[PDB]
């Protein structure tokens, strides 16, 4: 499959986006996180590269149709880079459903 194929980037101390690996993204409820979460499974070894709860108030930003970019904590910035816009749209729609947004928005919070 390629529709959900992604690269995970993380911003480092030197403010470079570090390539953390290629994988496939999905969403599901994760009990230990108590909410719908984004999961990325690594192409390399099938491990979870990402397991990130969709908080209700996180500002997710869609950039260039194929990037979903957000702050995961203090000094912790992440980006999902999608191979396909169609896949980006699916995950964006799910984020918007969880937060209660119109999926035509390009950022899920004001400011």
């Amino acid at each position: 499959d390629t529709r959900r194929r992604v690269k995970l980037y993380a911003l480092n101390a030197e403010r470079q986006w570090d390539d953390r690996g290629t994988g496939h993204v999905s969403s599901t409820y994760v009990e230990r996180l108590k909410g719908i979460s984004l999961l990325v499974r690594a192409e390399s070894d099938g491990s979870l590269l990402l397991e990130s709860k969709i908080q209700p108030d996180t500002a997710y930003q869609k950039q260039q149709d194929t990037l979903i970019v957000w702050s995961e904590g203090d000094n912790f910035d992440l980006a999902l880079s999608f191979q396909e816009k169609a896949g980006c749209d699916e995950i964006w729609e799910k984020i918007c459903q969880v937060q209660g947004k119109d999926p035509s928005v390009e950022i899920t919070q004001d400011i």
């Binding site: 992604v6 986006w17 500002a59 970019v69 980006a79 880079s81 191979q83």
Partner: peptide, 11 residues
Amino acid sequence: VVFKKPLAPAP
């Protein structure tokens, strides 16, 4: 070319 890199982090 396959995967875009972000321009800036989110606000």
